[PDB]
Write a structure and sequence with these properties.
21 helices, binds iron/sulfur cluster, binds FE2/S2 (inorganic) cluster, binds magnesium ion, EC 1.12.7.2, ferredoxin hydrogenase activity, metal-binding, iron ion binding
C-alpha cells in the first residue's frame, strides 16, 4: 500500500502503527504513555498526535497505517495540540528539576523543552505529605510528579501478572498505588521495582538508604564494608555517558575508596558461598530423594511471590541464604576473626540492581546476636548519585582491585546476574561434588537466553535429572497455572522475578524508550558477566581460594555444623488459624 508522510511517498506492505512505521523511517514523532507496545487506553496522553488528511488528529501510537493516508507530523495544529497536552500535565506537576532524582534523564522534561510548554498555573503545594508515600522498605511514591500515564500499571501486569500497581479513586481523585492504597509491602506486591523502570519521571523511586550509609561513613568508630552485586559492574557506566555494556569493575573499586569506604569486598564472593551451600544441598536431596523439586531462594522477589501465592512450595526452597545475606552473615562473624574489628562496629553496605533486596535486608530474623547481616542497601542509581555528588570523575578513574579476603570470585559467581546464571553455576559445583571429580566441560548454554521458561536434562553421577529456569515472575505464574510443574519430575528449578535476570532489576539505570528499541539491554548487560566468566582462571565456586581458606579456617564443611547453623535461612508457611 501507499502512504504519504510529510510529502514523502512510501510504498509498504507492513501492517503496523503510524508511530512505529515512522520510527523505522527516520521520521520523528513524540510519545509519552506508549511503552512495551501498550499505551494508556483510558487516558491517552496524545503526545503522539499526528494529522491524517480527511480524518483529522489521530494518535499515531495505536492507529494502523492504511492505503491512501496522507500524514503530517509537524503542522501547526499538531504542535499546538501536543504543546497543550504538556501544558495541562504541567498544571499537575511540581516543576522543580533542581533537586530531582531524574534531573539528568527525565522524559517529561525533554518534552517540555522540545515544545517549550508552560503551565497555565504552576503547580506548587507546600506540603507534600499527602502526595508522598514512604511506608515501604523498597518503593516510594511522589504523586506531585505523577503524569498518570499508566506505564507502571501496564509494566506490573506484563512483568509480574500480579497487577499490584493499580489505578485508585482517592477521595474522588485519580491516583496510582497499591491495593486499597495500602503500603505495598502489605499487599501481594513483589517489590521488584519494574514499575519504577517504566516510570518516565521521578514519581516512583527506591526507598533511600543513602542517609544510613553517609552517617555510618562519618561515624568515627564505624568500619564500613561495601560490596557490589554482579550486575552493577555491567550497568552503572550508562549513567556516566560511557555507553552500554561497558565493564567498569575496576573503576567502581576506585570510586568506592574515594567515597570513604573502609573495606572493598564483592557480593560475587557471597555468590560462591551460596553455591557452596546450595550445591551441597542438591546432592543431599539426591541421596535422600527429595524434597523435589528444589527452588532457588536468592531472589527476594520470587520469595515474596511464593509466600503470597504458593506457600506450599516454601519448604522446597533452598535453605541457603542469598549471596547478599550470606555475605553479610560472614561480614559480622568471619571477617572480625581475621581483622580484629569489634563486630558491633562493622557496618555492611551492599550495592544492588534491586529494590527488593532492601526488603530482604530488613527482614527481622536476618540477624544474629543483635547484629544485622546487612545494615544498608543502595541501588545502582543511588551509588551513581553518590559518586556525582562527591564530584568523582568516574569515567577518568584508574582501575584498582578489591580486598581479596571476601572479594575474590570465580566465573560461576560472576554470572549470577543473568537468567540461568545461578542454575549453571550450581551445576558446575553439584556435578563435581556428586561424582567426586574435576570436570572439564562446565558450560550449560541450554539454560541461558531470554526465553521465558527454559528446561534441560542433565546427568549427575550416572543418573539423569530435570532442571528448569523460570525467567520472570509472569513466567512463574504461567509455569504453575498451566500445570507444567506436573508434566515431568523436576529436581532443581531457578526462579527470577525480573525478566532477563538481575541485570534488569528495579534498581538499575533507566533507559529511554528510544534506546531500548536500539539496544538489547538485557543481553548487552549480561554479556559483560559471561565475558568475565570466560576469562577468569577459576570458573567454579569451590575453586575460590579465598572462600576455601574461609571454610577451612572458620566454618568447616558446607551444609554441616556451623555453616548450616548460621549461613542458612528457612521460609515456612503460617500455621493454621481461624
Ligand atoms: S520529574 Fe522530570 S520534569 Fe518533573 S521535576 Fe523531576 S526532572 Fe523535572
Ligand atoms: S507513577 Fe510514573 S509510570 Fe505510574 S502513572 Fe505516574 S508517571 Fe506514569
Ligand atoms: S514492585 Fe513489582 S509487583 Fe510491586 S507494583 Fe511494582 S511492578 Fe508490581
Ligand atoms: S531478579 Fe534480581 S533484581 Fe529482580 S527482584 Fe529478583 S533479586 Fe531483585
Ligand atoms: S503515546 Fe500515544 S496516546 Fe500516549
Ligand atoms: Mg492501547
Ligand atoms: Mg568513616
Amino acid at each position: 500500500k501507499t502512504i504519504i508522510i510529510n510529502g514523502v511517498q512510501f510504498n509498504t506492505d507492513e501492517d503496523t502503527t503510524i508511530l512505529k512505521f515512522a520510527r523505522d523511517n527516520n521520521i520523528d514523532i513524540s510519545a509519552l504513555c506508549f511503552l512495551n507496545n501498550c499505551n494508556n487506553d483510558i487516558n491517552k496522553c496524545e503526545i503522539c498526535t499526528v494529522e491524517v488528511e480527511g480524518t483529522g488528529l489521530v494518535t499515531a501510537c495505536d492507529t494502523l497505517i492504511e492505503d491512501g493516508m496522507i500524514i503530517n507530523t509537524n503542522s501547526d495544529a499538531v504542535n499546538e495540540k501536543i504543546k497543550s497536552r504538556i501544558s495541562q500535565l504541567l498544571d499537575i506537576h511540581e516543576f522543580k528539576c533542581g533537586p530531582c532524582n531524574r534531573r539528568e534523564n527525565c522524559e517529561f522534561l525533554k518534552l517540555v523543552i522540545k515544545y517549550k510548554a508552560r503551565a497555565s498555573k504552576p503547580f506548587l503545594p507546600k506540603d507534600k505529605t499527602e502526595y508522598v508515600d514512604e511506608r515501604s522498605k523498597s518503593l516510594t511514591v511522589d504523586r506531585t510528579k505523577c503524569l498518570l500515564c499508566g506505564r507502571c500499571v501496564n509494566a506490573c501486569g506484563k512483568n509480574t501478572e500480579t497487577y499490584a500497581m493499580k489505578f485508585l479513586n482517592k477521595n474522588g481523585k485519580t491516583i496510582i498505588g497499591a491495593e486499597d492504597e495500602k503500603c505495598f509491602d502489605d499487599t501481594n506486591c513483589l517489590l521488584c521495582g519494574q514499575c519504577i523502570i517504566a516510570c518516565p519521571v521521578a514519581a516512583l523511586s527506591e526507598k533511600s538508604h543513602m542517609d544510613r550509609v553517609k552517617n555510618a561513613l562519618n561515624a568515627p568508630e564505624k568500619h564500613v564494608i561495601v560490596a557490589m552485586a554482579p550486575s552493577v559492574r555491567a550497568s552503572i557506566g550508562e549513567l556516566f555517558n560511557m555507553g552500554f555494556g561497558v565493564d567498569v569493575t575496576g573503576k567502581i573499586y576506585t570510586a568506592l575508596r574515594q567515597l570513604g569506604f573502609d573495606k572493598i569486598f564483592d557480593i560475587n564472593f557471597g555468590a560462591d558461598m551460596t553455591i557452596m551451600e546450595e550445591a551441597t544441598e542438591l546432592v543431599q536431596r539426591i541421596e535422600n530423594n527429595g524434597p523435589f523439586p528444589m527452588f532457588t531462594s536468592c531472589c527476594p522477589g520470587w520469595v515474596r511471590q511464593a509466600e503470597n501465592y504458593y506457600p506450599e512450595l516454601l519448604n522446597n526452597l533452598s535453605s541457603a541464604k542469598s549471596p547478599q545475606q550470606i555475605f553479610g552473615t560472614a561480614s559480622k562473624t568471619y571477617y572480625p576473626s581475621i581483622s580484629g574489628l569489634d563486630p558491633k562496629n562493622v557496618f555492611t553496605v551492599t550495592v544492588m540492581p534491586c529494590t527488593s533486596k532492601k526488603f530482604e535486608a530488613d527482614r527481622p530474623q536476618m540477624e544474629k546476636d543483635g547484629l544485622r547481616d546487612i545494615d544498608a542497601v543502595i541501588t545502582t542509581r543511588e551509588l551513581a548519585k553518590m559518586i556525582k555528588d562527591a564530584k568523582i570523575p568516574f569515567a577518568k578513574l584508574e582501575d584498582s582491585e578489591a580486598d581479596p579476603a571476601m572479594g575474590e570470585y570465580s566465573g560461576a559467581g560472576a554470572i549470577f546476574g543473568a537468567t540461568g546464571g545461578v542454575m549453571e553455576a550450581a551445576l558446575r559445583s553439584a556435578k563435581d561434588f556428586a561424582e567426586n571429580a574435576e570436570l572439564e566441560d562446565i558450560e550449560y548454554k541450554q539454560v541461558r537466553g531470554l526465553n521465558g521458561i527454559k528446561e534441560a536434562e542433565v546427568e549427575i553421577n550416572n543418573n539423569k535429572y530435570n532442571v528448569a529456569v523460570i525467567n520472570g515472575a509472569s513466567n512463574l505464574f504461567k509455569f504453575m497455572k498451566s500445570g507444567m510443574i506436573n508434566e515431568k519430575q523436576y529436581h532443581f528449578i531457578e526462579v527470577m522475578a525480573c525478566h532477563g535476570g538481575c541485570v534488569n532489576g528495579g534498581g538499575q539505570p533507566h533507559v529511554n524508550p528510544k534506546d531500548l528499541e536500539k539496544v538489547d539491554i538485557k543481553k548487552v548487560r549480561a554479556s559483560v558477566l559471561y565475558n568475565q566468566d570466560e576469562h577468569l582462571s577459576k570458573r567454579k565456586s569451590h575453586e575460590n581460594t579465598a572462600l576455601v581458606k574461609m571454610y577451612q579456617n572458620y566454618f568447616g564443611k558446607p551444609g554441616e555444623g556451623r555453616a548450616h547453623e548460621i549461613l542458612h535461612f528457612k521460609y515456612k508457611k503460617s500455621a493454621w488459624s481461624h
